[PDB]
Design a protein around this ligand. Sequence first.
Ligand SMILES: O=C(O)c1cc(/N=N/c2ccc([N+](=O)[O-])cc2)cc(I)c1O
Ligand SMILES: O=C(O)c1cc(/N=N/c2ccc([N+](=O)[O-])cc2)cc(I)c1O
Lengths: 115, 115, 115, 115
Amino acid sequence: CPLMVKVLDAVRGSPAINVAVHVFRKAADDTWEPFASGKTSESGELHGLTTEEEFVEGIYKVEIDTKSYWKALGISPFHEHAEVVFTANDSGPRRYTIAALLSPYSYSTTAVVTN
Amino acid sequence: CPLMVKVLDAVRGSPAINVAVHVFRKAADDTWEPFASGKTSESGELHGLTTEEEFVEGIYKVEIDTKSYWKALGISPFHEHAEVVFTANDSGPRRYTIAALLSPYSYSTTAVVTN
Amino acid sequence: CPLMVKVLDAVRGSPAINVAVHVFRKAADDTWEPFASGKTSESGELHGLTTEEEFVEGIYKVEIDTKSYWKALGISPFHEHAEVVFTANDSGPRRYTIAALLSPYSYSTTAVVTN
Amino acid sequence: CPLMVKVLDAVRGSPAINVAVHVFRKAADDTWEPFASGKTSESGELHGLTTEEEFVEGIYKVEIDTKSYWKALGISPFHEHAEVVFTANDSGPRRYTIAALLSPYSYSTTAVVTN
Ligand SMILES: O=C(O)c1cc(/N=N/c2ccc([N+](=O)[O-])cc2)cc(I)c1O
Ligand SMILES: O=C(O)c1cc(/N=N/c2ccc([N+](=O)[O-])cc2)cc(I)c1O
């Protein structure tokens, strides 16, 4: 709801389906604590990661497990994963979409923050 | 329905709203004939450009009027527009989404072809 | 020298070698007139397209023949080509590098403008 | 030499100058150990991080301090940094160029691997 992830495949021109995504939140001791996770759907989307109540201001890391995705397709990839690290703020749009476009040796990511 | 366009703004982290989009189809004499057009919605999307009946195999050009978009925001851009040129084929997924991510001096585009 | 093109392959993580590039300039009658052409080298670069003297103010189109590139690698890509359209030298002479990163269903392009 | 970083600014169409870059290598205990650091030059490039001798096989993280870059330009960006994580030299020595293209709410990264 307040945090959605969408993953696209630039080789096949398709959603990136069944990609593991792990979200972490930075703790007071500066370590990454697990926050939410899932696998992208047939549409390349992962919804329901968190709720407005739980998604408080803080520093979050979204890890997209790109290496396993490419290995499953038989394509040798460069990255171990794609990592998106950002601060969530309450004076900004209410909904965060993290979009990632994947190629074997490249990835691009953007944030769409609305409301 | 068979052809959708989605445009995102990498400076603001938002949909690119009210961007003019012109679609052309290559004619027998190799000229670009107007096919469909519109402006992106509040979600950065342009739906209803064509129908399955009209969207036959052929070469299509999607022109996204990025220069006017940036000028309206007071940002000096590099490109006159972004152009996406592709062949539509019936042996491929039925729905075409042309996605574009815009910055003043760069743009990225991908095709998501499903069904 | 004043206009250089660099092309990278996001599947292999390599320069995109032997990519054909055609440059056009918009004429007074609003047609695209041939201006220069060449092919990328082993480093993915194309130098020597023009000179400061010939590269006058105007609207230029750099067409990168991505479809032929992918087909030769056994990939049936989405786009016919990547086109980069821009006004050049309207504030006086500048040096332009057009960079493109290629995937079968996506491309990204940026400009580096100096002087 | 074996590891170079190039950073471009998609808003200004320029090299991204004075960007801090920190490189880490995963140690036997699974922690990220400092490996090398530096700042991009006037050309957006960072050379001399390491040598063929010191750049042994391993998992490396290249952290590009994009937030500090944008803040100094008066832009409040989305990401804390851009992180590029990859296994290096597991098939023998190679030369790695990590390229990043930066916008306030987006970044793209690619790798060029030679030898
Ligand atoms: O829901 C969304 O926000 C959404 C975003 C999309 N684009 N993400 C991209 C697209 C291109 C690049 N690139 O080539 O740098 C990076 C990220 C596409 C669709 I379809 C979407 O539905
Ligand atoms: O030396 C290099 O490897 C080199 C790479 C360059 N592009 N990196 C990109 C370009 C586009 C995207 N994107 O928007 O997906 C991601 C990374 C440009 C120049 I000029 C270079 O000299």
